[PDB]
Amino acid sequence: IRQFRRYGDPRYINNEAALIRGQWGLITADFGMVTQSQMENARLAILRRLPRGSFTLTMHTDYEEFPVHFAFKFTTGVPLFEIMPISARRLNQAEAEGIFLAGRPFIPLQTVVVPQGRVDEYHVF
Amino acid sequence: PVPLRGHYCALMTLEMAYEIAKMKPLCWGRPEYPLLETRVRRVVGQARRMGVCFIGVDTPYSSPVKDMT
Amino acid sequence: PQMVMSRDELKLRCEYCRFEWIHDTLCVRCPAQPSHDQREMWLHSTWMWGKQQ
Amino acid sequence: RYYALPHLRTGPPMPTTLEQPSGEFPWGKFSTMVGGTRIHPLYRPDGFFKDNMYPA
Amino acid sequence: ELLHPLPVRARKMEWLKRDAVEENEEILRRPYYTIK
Amino acid sequence: ISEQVQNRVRSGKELVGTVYQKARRQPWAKYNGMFPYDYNGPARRPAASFVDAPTPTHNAEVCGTAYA
Amino acid sequence: DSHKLREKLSSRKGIFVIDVRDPGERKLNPVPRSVALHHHDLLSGASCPILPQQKSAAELFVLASNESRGLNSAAALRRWGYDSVVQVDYNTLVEAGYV
Amino acid sequence: PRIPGTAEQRNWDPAIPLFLDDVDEQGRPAPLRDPSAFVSDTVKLRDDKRPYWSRRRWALTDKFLVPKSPK
RNA sequence: AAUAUUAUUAACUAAAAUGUUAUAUAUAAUAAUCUAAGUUAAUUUGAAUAUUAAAAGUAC
Numbered sequence A: 001i002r003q004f005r006r007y008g009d010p011r012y013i014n015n016e017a018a019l020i021r022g023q024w025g026l027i028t029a030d031f032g033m034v035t036q037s038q039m040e041n042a043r044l045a046i047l048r049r050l051p052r053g054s055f056t057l058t059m060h061t062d063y064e065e066f067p068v069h070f071a072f073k074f075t076t077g078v079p080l081f082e083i084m085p086i087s088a089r090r091l092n093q094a095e096a097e098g099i100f101l102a103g104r105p106f107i108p109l110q111t112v113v114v115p116q117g118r119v120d121e122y123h124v125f
Numbered sequence B: 001p002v003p004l005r006g007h008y009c010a011l012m013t014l015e016m017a018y019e020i021a022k023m024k025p026l027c028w029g030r031p032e033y034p035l036l037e038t039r040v041r042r043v044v045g046q047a048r049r050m051g052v053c054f055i056g057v058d059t060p061y062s063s064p065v066k067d068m069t
Numbered sequence C: 001p002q003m004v005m006s007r008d009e010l011k012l013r014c015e016y017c018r019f020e021w022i023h024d025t026l027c028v029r030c031p032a033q034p035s036h037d038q039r040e041m042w043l044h045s046t047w048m049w050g051k052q053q
Numbered sequence D: 001r002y003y004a005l006p007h008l009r010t011g012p013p014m015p016t017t018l019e020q021p022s023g024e025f026p027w028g029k030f031s032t033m034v035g036g037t038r039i040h041p042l043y044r045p046d047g048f049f050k051d052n053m054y055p056a
Numbered sequence E: 001e002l003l004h005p006l007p008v009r010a011r012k013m014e015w016l017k018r019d020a021v022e023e024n025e026e027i028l029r030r031p032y033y034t035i036k
Numbered sequence F: 001i002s003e004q005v006q007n008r009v010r011s012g013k014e015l016v017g018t019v020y021q022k023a024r025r026q027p028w029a030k031y032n033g034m035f036p037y038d039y040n041g042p043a044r045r046p047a048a049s050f051v052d053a054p055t056p057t058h059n060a061e062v063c064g065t066a067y068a
Numbered sequence G: 001d002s003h004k005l006r007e008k009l010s011s012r013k014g015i016f017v018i019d020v021r022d023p024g025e026r027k028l029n030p031v032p033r034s035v036a037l038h039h040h041d042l043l044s045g046a047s048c049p050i051l052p053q054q055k056s057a058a059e060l061f062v063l064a065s066n067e068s069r070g071l072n073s074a075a076a077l078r079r080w081g082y083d084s085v086v087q088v089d090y091n092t093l094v095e096a097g098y099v
Numbered sequence H: 001p002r003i004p005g006t007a008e009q010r011n012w013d014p015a016i017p018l019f020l021d022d023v024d025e026q027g028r029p030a031p032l033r034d035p036s037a038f039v040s041d042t043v044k045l046r047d048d049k050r051p052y053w054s055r056r057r058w059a060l061t062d063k064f065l066v067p068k069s070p071k
Numbered sequence I: 001a002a003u004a005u006u007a008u009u010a011a012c013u014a015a016a017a018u019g020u021u022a023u024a025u026a027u028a029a030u031a032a033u034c035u036a037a038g039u040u041a042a043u044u045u046g047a048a049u050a051u052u053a054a055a056a057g058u059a060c
């Protein structure tokens, strides 16, 4: 409540390499602040490119909102979206990245597409 | 196709698949080739692809015989 | 022609489309359907030092 | 307190049976032909409609 | 403000300052006495 | 060496002996621009030297044009 | 010491034994031909000029009570180029007639 | 002292050895019966470029990436 | 301590180790000669659609 300009500073690089439960995931590569509306735009743009018969888009919104207006302060490596399978459909990297490519522009900071399991942050970074 | 619906269409024995596959050879000059045991799978798998349920296969057991243990 | 930000953002959209060099600037020309033409954005073909950095 | 690694009593320095999966997307070098394929020109593949239609 | 880059030989001299400092600390890690 | 290797290896890609030449000469189409060796000069390589050459007897004498 | 015995008898003269050992027990035990060093005085490199000049030709005996500092001082010595180092405790060189 | 350097130098510099007496420096004693094998220092001088002279390798080497300047 | 107030500045003559510039810039390697058809036009959605309308994609 009534937090100062220096609070929840995203600028540090985190030690937590996230674990993405979904088959694919979209992960924050830099520091920044993201508006909710931007993530909604991203979500809709991604849902345009998904085969809704085999797939479900999971958005991680549970992070704190910080006053500016309320937005998110994102550290490197924080997961955003998850492509979760309802069936045996196994995407390639080109396909998954082609899917997240729609929603990348709306997000103001750089993002990486990461495959199922734990982020291998030697390869990502 | 099954995931499109979520239920199989009609049951079929592999007995019937042979008499379907008997009819399509590669060359009528030589009926034996290609061999049934192989090319039957094309029929089985296409029926599969159609959504046909099967007996020999995709269910554990073989259709009951009255007279034998 | 539309100017792409860099060489990576440059794709061949059609069957007849080609990579060509405009004086050290890499570009894409289609003899059919000219709306497919892409330039890499870079310095003018003629530039001095004070005039262009 | 100072912190230091234990010695090696047994087994290899880099985990062999315990390998983490490597995090790249596993595209074979020969399955996607891009680079790192050093193939002798005698052994050149996939010419089936160009020069490997008229072999040897 | 600082506008134009540092020239190369300046930072070469700075590197020389670094290993001069190091040359000092090696001396400092030598023993207090010597048994002869 | 490489062009000689190109010559004495078989013609499978391009036409030998024929006057067509599928790959047409287009010098103007290629890269026009200067490389860093166009500014800083040709890259330095070790000067080609003669080791253990015998001493030059007749260094005072002049070589005759050898057409004879 | 069916090997060590003839090694230390008459094979050469000697001052060959560096004992890194507590000052308390080197009065109790004492081996009176050994140079009494301190194990810190070895590792540090403050003993180098009295240690023999040719690094390869030498073989030195570390006389230690606790074997852990025998193992420490071995490394201390091979840091300065002494590779052949034999660790001996007190009772060992009793049977060798060295005391 | 028989210990080179002051305390400030000791807890600055990982060159001066630990002067621990009766224990091994690194955990418990090593068994008596090569870091560079897995550590890669290979400096790649020229950055490998993208094959515009081949049509298939151009699109197969595609990098899906959006340039973003920091805000 | 005792008292009084308050809202960069180069003797002279020489010596002297620290100013100059590392400018943006990467090419060669595609014009690219050769070929009959055959589970199969799978099935669904659709008026139609046969690899390339949508759906579904580990049948062979």
Ligand SMILES: [Mg+2]
Residues within 6 Å of the ligand: I049
């Ligand atoms: Mg269709």
Ligand SMILES: [Zn+2]
Residues within 6 Å of the ligand: C013, C014, C017, C030, C032, C033, C035, C036, C037
């Ligand atoms: Zn085009």
